[PDB]
Amino acid sequence: SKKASELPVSEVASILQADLQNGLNKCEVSHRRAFHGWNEFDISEPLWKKYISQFKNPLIMLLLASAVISVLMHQFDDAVSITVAILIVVTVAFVQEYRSEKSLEELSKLVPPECHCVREGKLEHTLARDLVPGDTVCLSVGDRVPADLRLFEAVDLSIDESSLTGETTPCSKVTAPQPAASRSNIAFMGTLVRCGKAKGVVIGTGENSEFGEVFKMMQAEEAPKTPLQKSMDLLGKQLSFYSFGIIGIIMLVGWLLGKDILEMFTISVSLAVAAIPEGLPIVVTVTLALGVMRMVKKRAIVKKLPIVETLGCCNVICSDKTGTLTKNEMTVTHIFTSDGLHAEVTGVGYNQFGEVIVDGDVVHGFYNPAVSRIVEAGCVCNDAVIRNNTLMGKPTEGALIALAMKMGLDGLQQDYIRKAEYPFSSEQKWMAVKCVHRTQQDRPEICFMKGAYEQVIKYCTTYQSKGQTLTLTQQQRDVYQQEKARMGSAGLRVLALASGPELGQLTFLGLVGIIDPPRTGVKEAVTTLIASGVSIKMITGDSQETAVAIASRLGLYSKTSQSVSGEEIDAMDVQQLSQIVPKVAVFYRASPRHKMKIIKSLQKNGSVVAMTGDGVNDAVALKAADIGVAMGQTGTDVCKEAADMILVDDDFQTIMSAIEEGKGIYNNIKNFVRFQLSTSIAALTLISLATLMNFPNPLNAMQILWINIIMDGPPAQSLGVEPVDKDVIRKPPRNWKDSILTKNLILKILVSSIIIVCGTLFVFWRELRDNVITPRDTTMTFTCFVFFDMFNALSSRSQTKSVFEIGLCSNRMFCYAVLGSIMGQLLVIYFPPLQKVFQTESLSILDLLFLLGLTSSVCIVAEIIKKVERSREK
């Protein structure tokens, strides 16, 4: 690395076999690949680390402690049943997390880091893993580096240092070799280009690069727990502590009654295992993993887990105009000169193929000096280049070059050679270079400048009319302004071009009409999302009329809408900015600092924002948003790294689905919480009243363990898996607090638990009317509680819908788990060893039917009160 850094580029190409302008032939590519290897360094453990990582959840430690407490008093079946419950919950958590991580890696593999490399001397699009040492690669603005790059030419190259060094300080690269951001001659793995263009050969790939150890370290860190995950860890711990208090009160009431110490210790350990939500963090992890799985199915790369839950709370979606709502395909269509003569331009694309026609006949070369001067100001000025009908740099600069190569003025791009340049910045809104003719070296250098029309007409001094140069006046500014407004209101992006001998001595030449089509599928999407209670906006760097027209064609702009500029948005303080910002749907002439200020102004109001943008201007605002979204086909790698979400199919129907699934996660969680809490309170109050009543306890410790498997295992994880509904999608977005245990939900939980307890007490007292103690009554109440539990599970399947209107075919896992619990209960009734270990004997068919109806009662009452609430809503 350093030895090649102090080595000259010619000596570098002498040490390693390469051609400087023609790249490597594919035979030599395969020859270097057979020895050096691929770009991926070795391999990136699920069998051992991922399975053992689930056992450090605190509720899992406490259930393991209860199991080893049961081991200390040596009952085998209690300990193995607690361990079976623990094994099942960590198994489903591990398999869902593993599947989500594998699908995430598959989708991140599906998009490759693309490279613009000249393998055969022509511009080709290759991947990062296809690169071999010796290949020379062109670097674009906002491109991640393909390999360890040694650059032979660099007119203007800028390399960030935040990837490895961790510093946000800007850094530049020097073409001349340096003896001995350590060395600016050699480009580093992991960095990205923030500005400018350069070309360079590569010295090594894969393991042989020094900077692979930083990537090895960055893979080591685990994903931190989401605020939802910590919140429901708190909820599970507080439910555990409330159940512990209730069970301790039961044990004291039990001690006074004097019931056997060992049997009540088993019943209390069983009740503690049951009522604790061992499956609450596992069901939260299952919901998040399934949400990531759906995002992969919706073609979205989600880097971190909290994005899946913050998309459900989203109520404002900001965006950009080019690259997000318009496809960032730019082409010059109309030319208006400073003379007043107008030209219309032919063709679509970044092509050399088009016609420019004035007054009814075509113009080319140096036929008319105004349009030729405008076109020439559109080739030398652009840093970007067009090679083999492919766009390399930014899409607007290419449009003018496409126009420059349309009119027949390609070679002046090369003839002119620049010395010092003024780079384009989003805050600066203007571009400028001074270059000198190759053939006419005696002629002095002259500056060319392209930028926002207001800044351009501010900077230049004079104008051109009738082929003559005259000083700019106010009426000339007025005619140029009305013309610019006409281009903007027609829907044509405006670039104003001017030329002059020196900066500040420039002269205005005219305008170019750049059109960009709206991205297909955005208008119906934005209509749907606005109909779903979100407020999608438009943050733009372009003019008022362009952004307003594009928002109108897209339907973003109402008939009475307010649009605020950048100077006005930095004029207002934050509170009245927050007041005026929901009315605004079009922001324009906004710098990235303005975009960050809009994002923060909506963030102060409690509104969860989701910036969907593309650009290299400043991706810190994408980190400032609650959700960072970037596009895949036309998306620069800096905003892809900064994004919290990447969509590769580039339709606004997916960000729409992300909010839908983030909403449905909480509904599935509500189903789990309702079901488990209702049966936990039912069993707890059952044991509390009977132990207090002096009656024999209706359920045994093994029976409460089987009830725990029902209440926390796959019958409850099924309710955490249940697919979303379209009607609960149409509900407006919720606040940041989850607000899960609502008053209606707690009322429903108490109603279901009260019906379960009353039915169990009725059957228990009915079998105790003859005042004898037999296992018949305790298996009667065990079967009654188990059937009540599956009926309360079926009642918990949908919060706002009736149990019949949804259907059992929606959730296959619920049907499988219900059938499994029914068959396990019937084996407890029928199998004589299971009869001995559960203190159970067989029952009759009519008794089972009577229990089935008595437990259907809670489902009937549940659908009655849900229909009553729905009719009250109507």
Epitope: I357, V362, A490, G491, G513
Partner: nanobody
Framework: QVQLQESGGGLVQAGGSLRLSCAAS????????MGWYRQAPGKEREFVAG???????YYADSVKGRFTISRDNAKNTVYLQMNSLKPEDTAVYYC???????????????WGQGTQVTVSS
């Protein structure tokens, strides 16, 4: 307005011969440019045939000579003749016809839906 429907198109192997045909409902003598634009599967859009007001037929660099254009006025259906295309040169072939507007800065460029050409085997 011009509504564009493409006829005689569909995927063909490398080395084959076929005649494209694009039907335009509107006039051609008032139009500025009758053009054919390619859209490669997975890549950007270029063109394959184009004739404008200046009577200069445009042939792309990949298909110079072997892709040819012919058209008349009354039939309102411009053709495109291609010979021996390449697998990298496959595309969904669009249609584009616009008029000459300087009062109205309107997008008179209308695209057709086109037809897809891809070489795999």
């Amino acid at each position: 307005q011009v509504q564009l429907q493409e006829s005689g198109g569909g995927l063909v192997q490398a080395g084959g011969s076929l005649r494209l045909s694009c039907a335009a409902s509107g006039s051609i003598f008032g139009a500025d440019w009758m053009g054919w634009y390619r859209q490669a599967p997975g890549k950007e859009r270029e063109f394959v045939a184009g004739i404008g007001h200046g009577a200069s037929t445009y042939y792309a660099d990949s298909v110079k000579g072997r892709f040819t254009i012919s058209r008349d006025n009354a039939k309102n259906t411009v053709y495109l003749q291609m010979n021996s295309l390449k697998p990298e040169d496959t595309a969904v072939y669009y249609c584009a016809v616009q008029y000459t507007q300087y009062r109205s800065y309107d997008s008179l460029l209308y695209w057709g839906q086109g037809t897809q050409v891809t070489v795999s085997s």
